[PDB]
């Protein structure tokens, strides 16, 4: 006998079994690292996708500046990625989109973003995945580096009493011109150029956690200076993407399916009996190595052209900050003797000192870039490595999709679709099995004009019924999702009265998005409960455990009868179910907990979501 766990795909669909193809969600044990090898290949492919050779030495660093925008050359083999952007076509597409949506559209959106920012407190910057400290030269949460920056400002030139985003930004600006800056270390100070560099430094993070593909080997990790301007630009781009029908970035699921079906139905009701449509599942390649902040700057200028000069100048900050971005090279190379009994370790700044020892592969990837190196970093003048400006990239993609001219109209063909950050789905329309090819080629050309490329080994197409988008494998029916998320206690331990409620809410959400079903949700619940217990080293009372926390619980338990009312953290049992997720177990056991136990737990006169006497400050 033999086995083949794919024969079930013959007499069945794929929307029902595709889940079996990918492992279960969780932290990737691959340990995708960010090494000097990886940092250098990326930079090379970046400079190469720029099909030009022009440069211009600066005046703030005495360094060349590869200006890869509006200077396209090397037309040969243009099916491969490109990064040289054309401003004329960009502004033309922006104008088309404006005309479609309306005239005072960009103005209204920028006004909303402004007013939202005004009442904003700089403290918001503490809400971020991670950043890069410019003093310790490391990566940390936002709050830590923020405290470092504010206390350094205090130590050097007095405190920052703004308590607002705008004063913070202006303080950063002023600091750009300070000659000497101080900070507590292991105390030390620095000069103007070094502080500038540090502020324009970036570090490659190894973390890449998500479903689909973990292509984020070297996800960026900027500092704190540019953070608020990036937040502002993202707020504006978000306010814009909301009004756009073909923008699935800000949210997903129910709304996403609504957008899908609206699009499909409008299409079906649009064309005629002679036309026949088609779909394409596209996947933009190198969406980070072909997005240039210069085009973003010109676009923001064209946007704010008619608005308060305040926003005109503000939106023009993060772009220039990305036009000049020093990239921190990872850990340096290491030497070794033949038998490997000895091994030197060297940093990146000195690899230019032993370039003779290194093997030819590393040697042909290091010399052409030595020009752009200063001490240990690389002056990257463009590209976009961070997972930032995703909203803005999506806006540019939608601009690409809202194109239409008379050359197409004459042939009776057109297109439309939807675009995520770097993944999209196209729907072409025509009346011949050949004009479809012409339309596809036209679309690819207009996309390549502005660096937006497409893959050939990962982008396919077929008739309209079948496609895929953001793991939501759409079909004639039976829309199947695969974005099943889950919590993680060991990595994020907060309290024994919040994690469980948060997990219940998460499961509820996943059910809403149809990524989970009743039985699946119940199994996940009974699994997360055990994970929680094992995390905090707690068990029920029926169990014959001998752990520390159980000892006392093994003696002060007979003093109660409302075992049902007991808390999970205290030898309790579950009572919540599908229809009782939004309801925390506490609210569900209040009237049931013994008066003595309820009161012992609810005592604000204690040494320390329903605020329990279960917190771990």
């Amino acid at each position: 006998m033999e086995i083949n766990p794919y024969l079930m795909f013959l007499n069945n669909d794929v929307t029902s079994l595709i889940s079996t193809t990918y492992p279960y969600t969780g932290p990737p044990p691959m340990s995708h690292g960010s090494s000097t090898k990886y940092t250098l290949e990326t930079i090379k492919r970046t400079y190469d996708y720029s099909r030009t050779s022009v440069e211009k030495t600066s005046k703030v660093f005495n360094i060349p500046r590869r200006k890869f925008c509006n200077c396209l050359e090397d037309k040969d083999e243009l099916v491969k990625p490109t990064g040289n952007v054309d401003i004329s076509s960009l502004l033309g597409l922006a104008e088309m989109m404006e005309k479609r949506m309306g005239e005072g559209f960009f103005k209204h959106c920028v006004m909303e973003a402004e007013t939202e920012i005004l009442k904003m407190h700089f403290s918001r910057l503490t809400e971020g995945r991670q950043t890069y400290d410019w003093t310790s030269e490391r990566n940390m949460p936002a709050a830590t580096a923020l405290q470092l920056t504010v206390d350094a400002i205090k130590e050097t030139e007095g405190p920052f009493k703004g308590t607002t985003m705008l004063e913070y930004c202006n303080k950063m600006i002023e600091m750009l011109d300070w000659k000497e800056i101080k900070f507590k270390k292991v105390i030390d100070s620095i000069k103007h150029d070094e502080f500038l560099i540090r502020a324009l430094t970036i570090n490659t993070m190894a973390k890449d956690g998500e479903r689909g593909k973990l292509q984020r080997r070297a996800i960026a990790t900027p500092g704190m200076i540019v953070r608020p301007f990036s937040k502002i630009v993202e707020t504006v781009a978000q306010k814009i993407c909301e009004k756009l029908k073909e923008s699935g970035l800000p949210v997903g699921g129910n709304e996403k399916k609504a957008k899908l079906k609206t699009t499909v139905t409008s299409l079906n009701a649009r064309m005629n009996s002679d036309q026949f449509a088609v779909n394409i599942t596209g996947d933009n390649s190198k969406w980070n190595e072909c997005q240039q902040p210069e085009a973003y700057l010109a676009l923001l200028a064209y946007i704010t052209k008619d608005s308060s000069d305040l926003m005109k100048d503000l939106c023009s900050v993060a772009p220039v900050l990305f036009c000049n971005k020093f990239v921190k090279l990872g850990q340096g190379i290491r030497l070794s003797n033949k038998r490997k009994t000895k091994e030197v370790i060297i940093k990146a700044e000195k690899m230019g000192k032993y370039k003779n020892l290194m093997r030819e592969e590393y040697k042909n990837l290091f010399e052409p870039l030595e020009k752009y190196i200063q001490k240990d970093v690389c002056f990257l003048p463009g590209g976009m490595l961070m997972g930032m400006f995703n909203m803005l990239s999506t806006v540019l993609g939608v601009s690409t999709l809202c194109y239409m001219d008379e050359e197409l109209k004459a042939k009776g063909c057109f297109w439309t679709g939807l675009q995520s950050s770097d993944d999209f789905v196209l729907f072409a329309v025509a009346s011949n099995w050949s004009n479809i090819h012409w339309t596809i080629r036209r679309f690819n050309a207009v996309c390549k004009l502005i660096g937006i490329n497409m893959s050939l080994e990962k982008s396919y197409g077929s008739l309209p019924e079948l496609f895929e988008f953001t793991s939501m494998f759409f079909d004639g029916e039976f829309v199947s999702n695969l974005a099943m998320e889950l919590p993680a206690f060991t990595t994020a331990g907060v309290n024994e009265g919040v994690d469980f409620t948060a997990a219940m809410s998460i499961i509820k959400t996943n059910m809403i998005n149809n990524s989970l079903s009743p039985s699946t949700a119940l199994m996940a619940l009974r699994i997360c409960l055990q994970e929680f217990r094992a995390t905090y080293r707690v068990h029920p009372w029926d169990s014959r455990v001998k752990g520390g926390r159980m000892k006392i619980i093994n003696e002060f338990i007979k003093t109660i009868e409302n075992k049902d009312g007991l808390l999970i953290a205290d030898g309790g049992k579950l009572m919540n179910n599908i229809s009782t997720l939004h309801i925390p177990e506490e609210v569900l056991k209040f009237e049931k907990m013994d008066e003595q136990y309820r009161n012992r737990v609810f005592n604000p006169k204690n040494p320390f979501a329903v605020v329990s006497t279960h917190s771990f400050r």
Partner: protein, 599 residues
Amino acid sequence: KFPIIANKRMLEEAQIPKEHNNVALWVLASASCINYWNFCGPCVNNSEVIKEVYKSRFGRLERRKEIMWKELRFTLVDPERMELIHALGGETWIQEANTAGISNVDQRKNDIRAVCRKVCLAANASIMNAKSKLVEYIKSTSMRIGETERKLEELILETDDVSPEVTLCKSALGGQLGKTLSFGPMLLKKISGSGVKVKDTVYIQGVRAVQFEYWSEQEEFYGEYKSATALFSRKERSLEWITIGGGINEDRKRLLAMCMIFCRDGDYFKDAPATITMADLSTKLGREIPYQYVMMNWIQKSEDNLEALLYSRGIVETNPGKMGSSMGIDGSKRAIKSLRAVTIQSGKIDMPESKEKIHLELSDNLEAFDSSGRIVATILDLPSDKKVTFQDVSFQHPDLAVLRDEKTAITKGYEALIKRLGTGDNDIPSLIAKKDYLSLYNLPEVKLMAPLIRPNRKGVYSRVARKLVSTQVTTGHYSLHELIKVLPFTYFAPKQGMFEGRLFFSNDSFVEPGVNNNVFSWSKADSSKIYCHGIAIRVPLVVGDEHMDTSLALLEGFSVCENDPRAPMVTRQDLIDVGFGQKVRLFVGQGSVRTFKRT
């Protein structure tokens, strides 16, 4: 060790000693300190404040508690609820939970149609008394329909809801019809034309032959399936043209296949698939079946059969200007290739109405005939028998319901064992006080329950049960619960063998002493009750100590004793090689360990 921070005065004011029982608890502190604080600490009364502050959450809980849960149903798409929409309705399923509104009519329709299906099926057990047994079932079936205790002899008529079962049961009542038809689950209707019956043959395996019938003239109809309309014309055993206005893939596919069978178009009416030859059984247990219903059943088995049937229908390449009204193999609204003589469109085809009532004539197989044949309904167009709990119903005539299962058999056996007690002589307590257990091994009720016992290894079960019975009687220490539990096994003769710890019936269920189970459970503080699948039963007597002595109801030749961890854990097998004065621990259930000593 002490990562968790705390306050200092808050600690001393509560008098929290460190290392209470070798647990430090601690400025810093451990986590166990919280348990010590919530188990032995200060007492407040802040319930009202907490509730007021968390009013929104507790109002959500209240609302939740203010629900009347209803049934659920699997189906598709043709604020206070947003808090629960996640648990209210998905996409394949939905729950009809309501809040304040009540109207019991459509549920009543489902009930009446279900029971009509049931009864009409029940009448399909003979060959001659069909109509008679049917009508007598009807006359013996009353219901608390809605709120009124009505009978099922007027509802079938007073109601106006077309269905195969309603019609099949009302024709026998000489009731009015509406000219509607039912070919399987599909609903049909005539529009124009007419014809006469004609016979033809069809092969099976390429050698045999079977006769079917059809019509030779032209005639147009109005098909209709779940969320799918249609119109079509049949001519000479073949489908000429057809159109559809309800856009769904599966619905359209199945409706088209059913209309094709209704038109008998296709080559599988000349020969048959190689799957049918596997059976060639166009027959029931003792009845005959046409070819159409056999083909249909063959479709219901798998959609591959549907695809094969549709391929039998010619497939061609669509021409320009027709994509908008073309079709695909999978119901695709438009395609570069479609099927012959098809037309897709949007908007459901408005169905006509016939205001002419008639009466039909039932046959041996209950098939009704209005005129010129033209069968309107039958049992063949029904689903298989589906057991469903019926309430608000009374069904008196035999064949009403088997009402006989191993579970119910055991329940009744135990009820009889309990009643036999009867607080009198020649009953359980008298024989106990008399110490005459042998008679217990000869009662009638145990003899009635014996057939429910696993036969292969009943001797050992009887041996063990008699052991327990005698050991609890002679000494006078016993427990009526475990006794009654094991009694049904003390009928056959004892034999040697290997026992495991469970007594298995014939239905693969089991029972175990010293523990509780769904089939049989009980507990102290309610000893006057005995649960059987949750059904609480009463004891004709009262006891406060007759049950408290279970030291001999766990094992056969042993007795419980004081707990002792030093004693080694053992199994049920090595017990034979133990001695006296030798304590031993052993599991008595799930994570339940107890110590035992011989005798």
